[PDB]
Amino acid sequence: MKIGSGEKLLFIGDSITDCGRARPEGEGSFGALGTGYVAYVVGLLQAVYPELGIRVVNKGISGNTVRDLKARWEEDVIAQKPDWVSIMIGINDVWRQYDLPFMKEKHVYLDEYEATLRSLVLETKPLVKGIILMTPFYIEGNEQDPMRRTMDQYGRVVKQIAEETNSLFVDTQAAFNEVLKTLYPAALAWDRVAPSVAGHMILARAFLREIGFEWVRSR
Amino acid sequence: MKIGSGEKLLFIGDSITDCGRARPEGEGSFGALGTGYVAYVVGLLQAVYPELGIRVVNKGISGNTVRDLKARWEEDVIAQKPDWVSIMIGINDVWRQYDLPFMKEKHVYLDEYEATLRSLVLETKPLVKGIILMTPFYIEGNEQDPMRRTMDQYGRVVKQIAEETNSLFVDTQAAFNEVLKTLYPAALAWDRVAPSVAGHMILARAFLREIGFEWVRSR
Amino acid sequence: MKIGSGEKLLFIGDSITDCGRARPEGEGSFGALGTGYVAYVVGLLQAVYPELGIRVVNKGISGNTVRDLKARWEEDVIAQKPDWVSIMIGINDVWRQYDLPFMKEKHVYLDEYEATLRSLVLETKPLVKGIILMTPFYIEGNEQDPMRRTMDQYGRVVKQIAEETNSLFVDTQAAFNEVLKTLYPAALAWDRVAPSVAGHMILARAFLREIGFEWVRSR
Amino acid sequence: MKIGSGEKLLFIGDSITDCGRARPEGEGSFGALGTGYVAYVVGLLQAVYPELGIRVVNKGISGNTVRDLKARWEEDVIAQKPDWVSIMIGINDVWRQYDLPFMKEKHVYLDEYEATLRSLVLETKPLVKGIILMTPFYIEGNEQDPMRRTMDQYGRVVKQIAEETNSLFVDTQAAFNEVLKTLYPAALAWDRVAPSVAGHMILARAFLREIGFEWVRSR
Amino acid sequence: MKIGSGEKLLFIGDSITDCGRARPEGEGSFGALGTGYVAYVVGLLQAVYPELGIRVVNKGISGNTVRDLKARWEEDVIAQKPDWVSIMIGINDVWRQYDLPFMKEKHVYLDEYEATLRSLVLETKPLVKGIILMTPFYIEGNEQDPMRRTMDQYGRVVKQIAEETNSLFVDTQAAFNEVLKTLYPAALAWDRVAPSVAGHMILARAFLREIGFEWVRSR
Amino acid sequence: MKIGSGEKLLFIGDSITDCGRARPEGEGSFGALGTGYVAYVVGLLQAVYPELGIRVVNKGISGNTVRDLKARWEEDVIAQKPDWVSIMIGINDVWRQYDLPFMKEKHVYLDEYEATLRSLVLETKPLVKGIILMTPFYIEGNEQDPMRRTMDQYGRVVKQIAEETNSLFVDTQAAFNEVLKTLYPAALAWDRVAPSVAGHMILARAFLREIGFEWVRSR
Amino acid sequence: MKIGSGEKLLFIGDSITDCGRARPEGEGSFGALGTGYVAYVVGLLQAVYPELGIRVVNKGISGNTVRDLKARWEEDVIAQKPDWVSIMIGINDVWRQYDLPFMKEKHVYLDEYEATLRSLVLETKPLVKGIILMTPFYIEGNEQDPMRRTMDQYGRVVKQIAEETNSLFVDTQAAFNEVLKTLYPAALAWDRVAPSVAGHMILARAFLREIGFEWVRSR
Amino acid sequence: MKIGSGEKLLFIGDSITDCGRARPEGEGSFGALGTGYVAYVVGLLQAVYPELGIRVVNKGISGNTVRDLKARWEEDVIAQKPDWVSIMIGINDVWRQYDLPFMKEKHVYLDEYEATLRSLVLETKPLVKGIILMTPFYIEGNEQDPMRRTMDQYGRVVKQIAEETNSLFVDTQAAFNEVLKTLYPAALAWDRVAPSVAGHMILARAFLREIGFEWVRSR
């Protein structure tokens, strides 16, 4: 378990992170974390490591792109003095290119995305114990579907950044890809983005595996 | 994994099982399974065993005792033709004795509890592939608190029926007891009964472990 | 114009047809026809052929398959004594196979679909002046996506019944396909099924063209 | 098609334009345009010219007279940097004279109306590719009904302005007049102002005809 | 005053009579009589003839034609044992011809109107002390508007039945006509049917004058 | 009729005047005047004198005492530039003495009441055509009931003020007293203050009689 | 204390008893007893006699007269097998005579009141351990107010039945009368019937004193 | 009775005091005091000492610790110029230690609690006639339950402070302890903190006993 006792773990992202969490503070055991993967992570950490006393904060905001993260980073991240920051962003940065292909101010292209995400990591790294970069995802098994193909480009950038900055790394697309060998996307999310409890569990598990969570502790 | 491909798993119980499930069907949407351990179970099974093709049904009803289960058993269990039935009942059977001590017809005392639950297990066993008996629980660490002491006795009844009937058995009290070495009850549930996400994860993990779930499959 | 003065045109289908229509009557206010292609059809007919005096009824019901149509056919179609019946069914028959793959009784497979739809068309044809058969559709441009591939097969069934029965025929998939040369699905419908105003205009225009509507009447 | 690819088309007016559109921005494919003729225009343009990539904004505000348009013109029009502006105003400027004939500060008389509308056109013309002036209307077939007779005076002024400024021109009253040869007003709008889907389609079609929309493109 | 001490006066009609009255009783609170002319009548009678001890019942139902009255006559009129029955019906009988011209079964044409209303008056007259027949009305000053022209014909029917049957008679159209020498319809009712407080006062005053009310009693 | 054409009549008072009127402006034919005596007055004036073109504004505010009137007089009265002001105040000034007999900052005693009301009249008189002073009231027939006895003292002061300032005068208590010879208070208002439609008609009539309203005009 | 351990005490009445109690059971939660004197009684008994183990049921129904009690007596009283029945009825029996003087079938005059209440007491007495008869009341200090005078007569009937039948007896009017030496009615209840917390405490204290409650137990 | 006529009694605390009281003023006989022990105290004082004319204000705020009281003391207490101040605080100061044992900024430890509470008393004492210190409580009969054991430490501090400052003193824990000899906590409050009407009556009675309330006055 990478996260130590008494430490503060902060999640940021878009609606997949937000999941109806309490605004502004996003902190507490009884609904304030929202109802998706963040909450599941905390639940599992408390069920299996209750003695760790890990404080968890949810700063997800529905609709955000990486440009929106940068715009609130000082207030929502820096000022919170976290020990661990988990970032999952990119879905909207890409989706807007496909659902509003002519409202282009809504799009964040890849080279802007890469530099902005890097800028967030590099600002934050000297202030925290660790950073966890979660790729965006798209629940779609055809690599050549245009949005899936774009999303994968953004996920490759995330991986690159994590390597180069010594951040932890969660490939959420690889986790979905496995389940997509069996299930058609609609069984997980009609819109291919916002999933079921199952999708959130896929994400929660992917995150917990990367931080060295044990389902039954050996120690 | 005790549960196998193509099987229908039906959960029944009180509010801990219900958690806002869709009535009457308790199946078949996103959200139809409720927002507690039953949903978490189905999500983790889907995340880790997507190919198993399990159908899951949530017949939990808030407020039920085992007397209420008996009254709807035919329509809600037997008529559903499940392959597997999971029962978690007893919390209200006990809690009414303590919160409404003078309304005795709302109590289900130990003789009624054992005979009824026994009868339901005996009746159902030959019609299904398997039964899972979950103990009720009380989120309270002091064995001599009166309601914890009573709830532990009711759990002994469940354990003994499961043994007699070669049912699977989940000791939910023991799962909470482990966490209660560290956390005061209120950290998990103000009222010592209806817990947080963490509590429902304690439950879901206790269920899954009993049915041979692996967090990361070795094969 | 195939539809003539004084005729009653009854539309039946699933949510794509329903679009919040008034239940049970589906006629006779402002708003009773719902807010999608059925209403747009009635509006354009009124704008361009005000003198035609068409009565229009919307018997769409959200969630329906052709099995559901059959169960209400007598009350909702035959008892209404329509002159013209428009049917657009199949989306849910197919989508349940993909979004709830393990709940097989909710699926309407191709044998049940063809026999039922056929039976309804055969039964209705001698009681009415005319039938319009609209294909189901899936807003997805890749023919080998599994649900698009299945939906195209169901459309072939509709086309063949319409041919056998000398019904009018609207290929809604082809209409979407044309736009999908330019737009990614999400621009029209996140879930690839329930579209925007633009999608409903694609539908209404496909219907109208089949019934000989002219945007500006040449006579 | 007068409108070219990538261009921005902005509609302004009163409730007939507003139709519940999103405030303040009035822009987007999924409800932000409101539910009347603006939305229908955009829907048809996307269904038939999807590749044009026309951005559309709805700045209608219920209750407005031309005096209200002038009061918000800088923020709602100029600042938006549209390529094409469509104006439909006058209904309220006239209605108030008839429904609140003694709260006269609510009235905009014809010579004030004419000069204010001219002032809007002349300010805007050097900043855009084109302007479309839609007459107000009143759904009433008797030319001598007092409100209809007044409304027609205002429509004549609009036509004059469009001629003199080389603006495009939509005679909405002429479009209703045709349908009113068959339908009594109440079949379109009980209040003779705010119509049904049919009325909105009459308006949408009138607008699309003036911009050179083709229902089936020859090219 | 035609109405006398201790008598029960029952009003029946459509929405103009209903005005949100309490269903089913239409009597007996504060507010049970609705918020239009029926309530105003009861208030003025109470203000000026408090000692009369009149019981008043409002059996108006929004949307009703005389065909609807007939279907509930036994339960809503005869079973109430009124001493006086006031009927104001015809607006919807006529308006459906104009707002839904093609839904002919919703129309109540003049032959059905005269026969039904006649039958109800003949049947009720020997069971009660008196009947008041109020004409329907249309708030429209042009006699040749088609719906006003039709409504005036229906009023002639009412006047003739009242004459034949020695019923009291209230010409509501004439009352509106007087005000319409000064006000355009919209000042009283946008839709020419459901008026303001002023319109309901026009009605209440027309009723009261017919029953010999004095604003200031001379005795 | 004391009120001439084109003139502005403003009512101020407490909840008996307010009756849910539109805040802040309190002006319009379709609900803005609220649902009690103000609205009835306007309704009758329009039904019988439609050609007068009297503008009416309702500045009633529930809970007000005369001290509250003074606090808003500049904004709510002076600034409105009325031609006629009607004041009805005192109910709360007195009620508070009886319902909150120990929260005394809520009480306005008689000599404060008298001087404040005088101050309002004397400020306003040089700015308007006329002032109408309506007494407060209490719907209670026993002159010696403590609140009734107090209320009458306040009504005597109002009368004195009106005499001394040449204001018009409405004795609302005398109007209720007449009806109270027959009806027990509860038949008009359970709380003896806020009446039924009948009470509002008693008030409306009292006001209209003082301004020279004719129910059937001789001229 | 007249009530003893293990006994079921059932309260019945009108709104004063109901106070929002849970329907139909009126027992068994927190809140099921309503928010007035019945709840206060149960609370004080629990605070001071926790060991008594009393079951309490609230069968009050807003609006009831003794005629309504009779119609539900079998289901709501006798079928509950109470040991003690407390009845407080008469307020509406009387108040309808005054607030709806002309709707005579809603009145329960003294002959009907005495015979019915008598019959219910006689019928119930041999089936239960004891009966408590509470007078109705009117919060009004003037004995010659007409409704107070009538209510006092109805109270005399209750007192006489209680005497005849050796029922316990609570004179609620006398309890209010004592406070009314100091407070005007409006301080306790604007409408002289439905009081504040203070009024319900007056009631609860009057009940408790009659059943031998001690505020501080001497033993 | 320690409280004299005309005096102002102000209660402050957490949710147990607040009970939904009116914000900000917390003053009035008809709901403004909230629905728990404060309201019951006032009710009893009015029922038994109506002539005292005691003004009562409720400044409870749900969630408060003693640190929160200090933060609002000037506005909510000092500025109100009370004659008597009742303080009940500590529940949250302690609860947070047990329900959010790792969000420690939410905890107020005992020595901070003691000094802050002292600081409140010492500031206030020279400004008022008297102060009443009510201990916090926890509805839990086992002295060794961790939260109960902590709560008792805080109650001992309260008692010490009251002794040292000559404040009145209410041991709310001792009052619950008596009832807990018979009832399990859940019969009074599932969460062991927020009780039933019974709990509020236990508190109300404890407070009234300390101020010398007599249930039947000797004088």
Ligand SMILES: [Cl-]
């Ligand atoms: Cl999002």
Ligand SMILES: [Cl-]
């Ligand atoms: Cl439960």
Ligand SMILES: [Cl-]
């Ligand atoms: Cl559907």
Ligand SMILES: [Cl-]
């Ligand atoms: Cl408008």
Ligand SMILES: [Cl-]
């Ligand atoms: Cl109607």
Ligand SMILES: [Cl-]
């Ligand atoms: Cl008021």
Ligand SMILES: [Cl-]
């Ligand atoms: Cl009642």
Ligand SMILES: [Cl-]
């Ligand atoms: Cl609290």
